[PDB]
Design a protein around this ligand. Structure first.
Ligand SMILES: O=C(O)[C@H](O)c1ccc2c(c1)N(CC1CCC1)C[C@@]1(CCCc3cc(Cl)ccc31)CO2
Length: 151
């Protein structure tokens, strides 16, 4: 099918959900689980740092987007394409894309619109994979992501 898309969605979906609920999903990973597990660990370390280092900017952009419902959540894909896709690609910007998504995911829980988190993860994945596949493939995908941030 599309293994890069499938793996990307599982990783992003899980990180967003875990960020919003504060609990880990004990369900096993699908294909390429070992890598996905390392990718999630990486996001918990780096993504979490991003949300703090840029807390003020993140809080400001969130207020800007004024997210209250499903229509508002749907409006985010155009903004992601405008800001993320139309720019240089490097792991740092991909981490910001996902980190702000988690920031939004937490917001969705506060306003009791939790059922929008999964659709949101899907939208982030679409933007990332469908507009930056060449780069991702060249950078060795998630294996490369894990390698890049290795400590
Ligand atoms: O190039 C830049 O400026 C940065 O490097 C950069 C890179 C990616 C990126 C953003 C910035 N942003 C903007 C920043 C300002 C505080 C968050 C969030 C983004 C756009 C809004 C909507 C949206 C909604 C969701 Cl669910 C996720 C990501 C995003 C698009 O992802």
């Amino acid at each position: 099918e599309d293994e890069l898309y499938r793996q990307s969605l599982e990783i992003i979906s899980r990180y967003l959900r875990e960020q919003a609920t504060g609990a880990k999903d004990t369900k096993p990973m699908g294909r390429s689980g070992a890598t996905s597990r390392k990718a999630l660990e990486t996001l918990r370390r780096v993504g979490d740092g991003v949300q703090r280092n840029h807390e003020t900017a993140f809080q400001g952009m969130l207020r800007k987007l004024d997210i209250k419902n499903e229509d508002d959540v749907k409006s985010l894909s155009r903004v992601m394409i405008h800001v993320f896709s139309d720019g240089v690609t490097n792991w740092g910007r991909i981490v910001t894309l996902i980190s702000f998504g988690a920031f939004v995911a937490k917001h969705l829980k506060t306003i009791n619109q939790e059922s929008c988190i999964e659709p949101l993860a899907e939208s982030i994945t679409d933007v990332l994979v469908r507009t930056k596949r060449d780069w991702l493939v060249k950078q060795r995908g998630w294996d490369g992501f894990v390698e890049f941030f290795h400590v």
